Amino acid sequence: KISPAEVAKHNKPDDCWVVINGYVYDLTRFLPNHPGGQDVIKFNAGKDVTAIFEPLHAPNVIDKYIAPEKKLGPLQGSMPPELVCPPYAPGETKEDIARKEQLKSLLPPLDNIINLYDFEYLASQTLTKQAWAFYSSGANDEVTHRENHNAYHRIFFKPKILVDVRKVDISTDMLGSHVDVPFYVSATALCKLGNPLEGEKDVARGCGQGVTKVPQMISTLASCSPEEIIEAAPSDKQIQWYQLYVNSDRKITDDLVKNVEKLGVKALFVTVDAPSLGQREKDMKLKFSALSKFIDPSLTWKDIEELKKKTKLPIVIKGVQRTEDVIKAAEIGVSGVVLSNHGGRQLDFSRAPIEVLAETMPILEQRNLKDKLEVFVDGGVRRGTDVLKALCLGAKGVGLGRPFLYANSCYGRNGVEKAIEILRDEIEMSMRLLGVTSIAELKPDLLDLSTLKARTVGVPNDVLYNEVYEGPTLTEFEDA
Amino acid sequence: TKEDIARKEQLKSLLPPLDNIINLYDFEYLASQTLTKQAWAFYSSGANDEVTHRENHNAYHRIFFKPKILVDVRKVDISTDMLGSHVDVPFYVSATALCKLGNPLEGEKDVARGCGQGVTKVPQMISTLASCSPEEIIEAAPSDKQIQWYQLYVNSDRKITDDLVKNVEKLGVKALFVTVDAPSLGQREKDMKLKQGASRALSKFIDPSLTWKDIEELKKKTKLPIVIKGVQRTEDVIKAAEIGVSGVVLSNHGGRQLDFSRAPIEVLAETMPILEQRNLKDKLEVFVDGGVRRGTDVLKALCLGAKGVGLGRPFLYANSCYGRNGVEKAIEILRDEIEMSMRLLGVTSIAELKPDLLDLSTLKARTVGVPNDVLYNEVYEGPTLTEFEDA
Amino acid sequence: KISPAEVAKHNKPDDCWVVINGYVYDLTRFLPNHPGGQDVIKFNAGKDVTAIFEPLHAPNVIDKYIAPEKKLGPLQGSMPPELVCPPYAPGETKEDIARKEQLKSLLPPLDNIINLYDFEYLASQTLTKQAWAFYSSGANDEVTHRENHNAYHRIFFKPKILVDVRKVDISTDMLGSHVDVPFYVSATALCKLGNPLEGEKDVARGCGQGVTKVPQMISTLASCSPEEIIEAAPSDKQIQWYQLYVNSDRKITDDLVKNVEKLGVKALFVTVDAPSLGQREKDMKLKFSALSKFIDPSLTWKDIEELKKKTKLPIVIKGVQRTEDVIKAAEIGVSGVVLSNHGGRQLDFSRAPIEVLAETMPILEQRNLKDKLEVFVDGGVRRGTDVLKALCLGAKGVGLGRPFLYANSCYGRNGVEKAIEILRDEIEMSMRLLGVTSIAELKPDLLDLSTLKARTVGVPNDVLYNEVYEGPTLTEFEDA
Amino acid sequence: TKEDIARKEQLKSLLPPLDNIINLYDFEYLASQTLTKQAWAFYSSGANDEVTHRENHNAYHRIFFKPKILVDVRKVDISTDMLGSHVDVPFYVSATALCKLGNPLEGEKDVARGCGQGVTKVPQMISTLASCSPEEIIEAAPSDKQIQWYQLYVNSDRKITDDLVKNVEKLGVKALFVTVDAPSLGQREKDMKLKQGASRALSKFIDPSLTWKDIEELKKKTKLPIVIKGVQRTEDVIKAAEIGVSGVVLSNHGGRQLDFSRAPIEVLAETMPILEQRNLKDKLEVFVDGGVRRGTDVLKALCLGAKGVGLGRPFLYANSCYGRNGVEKAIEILRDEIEMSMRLLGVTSIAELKPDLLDLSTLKARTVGVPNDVLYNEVYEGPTLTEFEDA
Ligand code: HEM
Ligand code: HEM
Ligand SMILES: Cc1cc2nc3c(=O)[nH]c(=O)nc-3n(C[C@@H](O)[C@H](O)[C@@H](O)COP(=O)(O)O)c2cc1C
Ligand SMILES: Cc1cc2nc3c(=O)[nH]c(=O)nc-3n(C[C@@H](O)[C@H](O)[C@@H](O)COP(=O)(O)O)c2cc1C
Ligand SMILES: Cc1cc2nc3c(=O)[nH]c(=O)nc-3n(C[C@@H](O)[C@H](O)[C@@H](O)COP(=O)(O)O)c2cc1C
Ligand SMILES: Cc1cc2nc3c(=O)[nH]c(=O)nc-3n(C[C@@H](O)[C@H](O)[C@@H](O)COP(=O)(O)O)c2cc1C
Ligand SMILES: O=C(O)C(=O)Cc1ccccc1
């Protein structure tokens, strides 16, 4: 027993007591190391914070990261009614229902989705403002995020013709496993914000339920536990990869890694591009209407060598942003590198991964390192021809984060299957048209790289000249 | 969708007189306002995102002219010789599937009549999937002098093709264009949106198995000159040369087959030097199409080497609002822009269109800009013009 | 006497009789050679066309270009009331007065004009649709016309600092005359459309009335005669230059040239860039709601040599569009060349004259021709820094056509003086700031030419990606 | 213009709490909604057309980063040494004439208090045309530790200047910035529009006669370190080096003096190699300003060689809506973007910002595009997204 007004006593920034599902916790040393930032816990401190908590955390977390002697005994009965926190939906009004009228069956039938951009549109409408902000933002005014997609558009194709492209096969192998498709679902934190009942379990299900099965990378900061997500996988032939942030308390990482090896995950993607979390202003603005110990900021190349000794899964460094570190990764002998800038949510004038890919692969060949490092690419990928562009430049496989978060959010596991289908078909269709019948035949010679560097900022222009100019017009109908 | 009231009132006597149609885009604006959705999506589409479809046109805007002045230009001559025959103008009507969608009554018979009713006889390429029989169409042609060509998909039941070839040859068509850029229907989502896995796009009519050997054999089975339609890289121009065909139409289907496919004019610019260095240029006729909507686009195309240039959609939507007379006028319009521009470049014969009339120095300034800085812009206010007195 | 219904008899395309100020004319052989195109005369043929005629033609024209035996005797009395043509204002409704309410004193006081773009704005509002169309159009969808101005914007500056720029002097000399300013008014056909009472006489007056006097180039197709325009010039120190189209009947040119030498004009600009008139669709569209003998299309370099023999004024070829013809002009030994594309009203993908200027001047130096040809530039020039850019590249002097047509149209002679003032001041002001004190010191080394060639056409982009993307927003006021 | 009701209601208690100001543009959006027209035109202007004014900022967008990963970055340090003194952060407040237009009550005294009230002490450059006396301002400074500099126009009555120098030196200012890019007030038509021939722009305060010799003499007449403010080409950097001054602020006044003046970052990128090749780099401090509105712009500037970067307008409009506290927060905001970015580039000291952290390969892709093809575009319709069911 712990008398509830004695609990509430400690409603302070520093020496914060809070109630989650009956038990009481001291969230004082904890507060500043919280993943999203201490803010949320501060504002709602000294209350029963259970509605904020439950629909949003991997069940395992308190037991896994809070000190045991901070897990304080139970709250006597309950909390005085305005102290049980209503669910977190900042900025949302009674809106929750117009977005649900929108959702309720007004969502077009899944057969009518023609592409990955339809899920986005549908998801910007029916998703909650916290979830839209969180899923869609980029760091800091967002030029690396949009850049990630536009850079694909600086590459055209050189199609071969009168080649018999009757059967086309797009399977490939990634990290020593034969995979059905050359792309994967990249780790995404908090999928229960968009798909509250199932979250990551439904992406596990859509990736392995159909005839095309796709690799799933699970996030260290996922709303579900890995053991739930791997259980929910419907096919023994589907693949799962685990993404790791290494903690300032290295034993916590140590136990996380031995636990996901045993659970069956096939590779470790260590995310190195986020020492400090990136400023995402669309979320910040909503919370009005960077270091912490969870992601240790002192991780160094010596830590990945010691991490190899502790594990038998191939290690992939996720977040490399220049050729110098792709070579460094090849020298410490790790299994592959994901050239990624974290969806343009971290350092904001970072380059487009396809542009770094282009720069790198000629160097790995000059240095005869090309066959000893698998290079993946993500960010910005939205059409099967964007996947073909990265694969012709020699990316081993391509990842997507947001397209799967919005298919899963709007249509759960069948949205994720429908997106896998949409893109498998775009790749295959665009491979006939490009004259090739297998991933192995996708080579740089099918691309025009000549204006890969046309990244222009135009001179500001001329509001008066253009305000007065008047363009030619079309023929007017006699009436209209 | 009940719009048929609006549309039948839009064409019927609200369409401006043919004499008020200044340019090939006017036809497109009026066709876009009157055709049935199903027709507009089929005619105006592109392969998903349509960036090669817009790029096709816009690469013309990367090429600037280098006009000669004080050159006598009272008399200019735009006739040329494409594929043995000698045609009136340097451009043609390209094959547009199912013309009866816009022109229910006469379909592609009306394009035939427009290509030969007036003064100028413009070549017509007949689609294997025409919604009128080759017979109907050839037979509709107004002149012994208008020349007609056949584009052919080769069918998987090859004897269908062998019948079809030998019968069109009977009907006196003057050449064969084997379209080869479509082993699979590109996703034209505009249609889809209104309307087998990645195989709905595969078809029985068009055979996915086609290969240079099939063209080699098709040479040896016909007398007509054969032109591969759909080449998209220099290597295939040089192969169409080594297997001995007549022409190559540098094309990508109107940006409705692969979507980051280069602009044909950008590929011409590069292939033609190679044909000169490999001495095989005089062998091959190289046609170009996609995006030509103005006389000056036609001329950049001829200055670079193209023997003749084709046009799909302008003719298709001229036909759809004004039938053969519309087709006839679009021919006049483009003939006058080509005449007027030559006289403004200081040239008089199509043979005089060479490259040195062209500023090609920014042909590769195909650029994607870096993302607009939304907030700098949201707070920035520009200058303002003067204001009239209110009173 | 010629009985008026006998007149009207011949109301036909071909065998067109028409009445202008009482006398009758046979405008049959004439019709197809008319400058604007036979259309206007056809439509209104066989009537009393005097209101179309009088407010729009140089008084001298009938007597000067019509065959004398085509000048038929007088119309008996008059024309049946609907056959006296109301004034040409195609597309104009009763509109003539809202544009005059606009004009009537609602036109801002001339002291409030800050720049050349204000006259344009004011002129697009109060000008008549025929005159707006005619003044503002370019040939054929208009990329060379807008290009002419934007190309200036591909050149930046390299200012010198801590230079004593107390007194700055901007006079220069052009075609052997010392001129107050480095720019001139370029020939413009029909100025009475915009300034009906005075037309070109008011530009003659504004160029020479003030303390800064500017060269006036008079047009062979001007609403006023040269003898009226030279009489109206208020200063004996102002300069006038004559622009010539040579006719298919070379004696007509022959007499035009000897007449303007005697009238006092100081140079002959022969316009060679218009064998055929350019398609200007904004006018064509209004006339619904190319060769002719007036401008001989067979003019050849041999005709400019024979024209030199006949004249003592310096000859300037106006309309050169490549370096090869600038050298040809230097070889036939003519006095200068105006690199111009006729305001982007003739061949429409022609280059920007500043860009050809840049290309040419290094060649005239390699070929030691630079001091023996004066090169002028026009088209697109709107700010004094655009004039400085052409002068640092070595243009001898810069011309403007539309800025003077819209100052004269809105404010007559004082608009033309105010524009001369506006630009004299922009040049002078921007010459202090650029560290130089005379035109002779304007040299290429003050410019950055490194992105002179950045003429880009971007890849079409991505309507779906951008339709769904949502940008970061600014802080909302508590209310607004 | 009676708006004063609207504006006094706009600031008074509709301005968001300082704690809700995410970035330096927020200040600009709120100042643009509340200042008097006369103030907004004076603060936010540019020399006619304002293309260098927008270009100043946008050239930052031509430079991309090359981050290092797996570099220990728990502890990063952004203090640097500008002009003998050792400052907290690598950036300063630049001289903004007449701060009392936005901040009537305290003018530039409030910027002094904002630059030293909080934790970080940011340098302040005082305008010779400040609307508060040097005395007032210096005296308002909260710390022995905040450093203050004086920018000086030299007056035509040079003894006024000689008095002014010797008295500011008395008041302990730590250096002199002689602004030299303004022998004549650029035409800021925004002001003009609301408000001698090409000589209204000439003034008595600023002397048009200034010349390197005057700087040479001014060296020999003061002890403070002198920085020429307004250099715009490498040659003048190298001359400021040969006449022995402390720094050069690569500047063009905020794009309100010559209007096609290059972007300072574009000129830094070019001058710094030259200073290395001519061995005189360690001699000169090179500051940069114009357009910096984000921490990453500051860092591109430091990676290229700049010793410190200044900012006019952000501080001026932070001061105008929130006075010294606004000035204090804009300092915090930029300090956190600079810290956060270094930790994301894998660097820890300002000395570690070198150039190899920069993708400078498209620094000269300052491009003007060719004219938008109005009609192709007017008739072109793009794809469309899916639609919710209506019911
Ligand atoms: C008992 C200690 C806590 C731990 C160990 C913890 C841990 C985490 C972790 C690891 C994440 C992201 C992934 C996941 O959910 O597993 C997260 C996110 C978050 N936590 Fe906690 N949390 C704790 C307490 C709380 C409390 C008491 C609240 C309520 C104020 C809360 C609210 C949130 C929210 C709302 C986010 C999402 C951030 C965003 O809005 O973008 N957490 N937490
Ligand atoms: C008597 C024989 C005629 C001659 C020699 C002649 C000559 C010219 C010339 C040289 C110009 C341009 C410069 C100038 O006005 O001097 C012009 C323009 C024009 N003329 Fe005539 N003209 C003749 C008869 C007519 C008649 C009968 C009409 C009435 C239908 C007419 C209507 C016009 C119009 C409206 C234009 C301006 C074109 C435009 O709208 O852009 N002209 N004419
Ligand atoms: C909501 C969201 C959360 C993400 N969370 C993680 C994460 O938990 N761990 C990680 O290593 N990367 C994360 N990513 C980024 C990567 O998986 C990946 O680089 C990706 O999202 C690339 O961007 P795309 O969305 O443009 O494909 C996240 C991205 C988004 C959009
Ligand atoms: C409605 C439509 C149908 C087409 N059908 C065919 C066809 O039957 N066979 C073929 O070879 N090309 C077909 N094309 C494309 C070519 O004739 C040609 O590439 C042409 O459309 C060029 O593009 P443009 O219309 O932009 O000039 C078709 C094009 C359109 C727009
Ligand atoms: C209404 C108008 C009429 C023109 N008439 C002539 C003309 O009579 N003769 C000539 O040689 N050039 C003529 N010009 C063009 C040239 O004087 C000149 O190249 C010029 O107008 C350049 O364009 P700007 O208006 O951009 O300065 C005309 C241009 C306009 C806009
Ligand atoms: C309102 C305003 C007034 C200015 N007054 C001066 C001044 O008194 N003296 C000076 O050297 N610079 C002056 N500047 C410009 C510089 O301090 C500096 O170049 C700065 O404005 C840089 O541009 P930014 O504000 O875009 O960073 C002023 C700038 C502004 C915007
Ligand atoms: O990985 C990311 O992109 C995240 O956003 C990290 C995170 C996870 C959960 C809450 C806030 C931030």
Ligand SMILES: O=C(O)C(=O)Cc1ccccc1
């Ligand atoms: O060749 C084309 O581009 C066509 O669109 C062919 C076609 C015709 C009719 C239905 C489907 C495809």
Ligand SMILES: O=C(O)C(=O)Cc1ccccc1
């Ligand atoms: O010189 C031009 O630009 C003209 O427009 C020629 C002209 C003159 C008078 C009427 C029509 C065309």
Ligand SMILES: O=C(O)C(=O)Cc1ccccc1
């Ligand atoms: O230096 C500047 O940029 C200024 O604007 C100086 C100034 C101050 C007050 C009135 C006019 C000019």
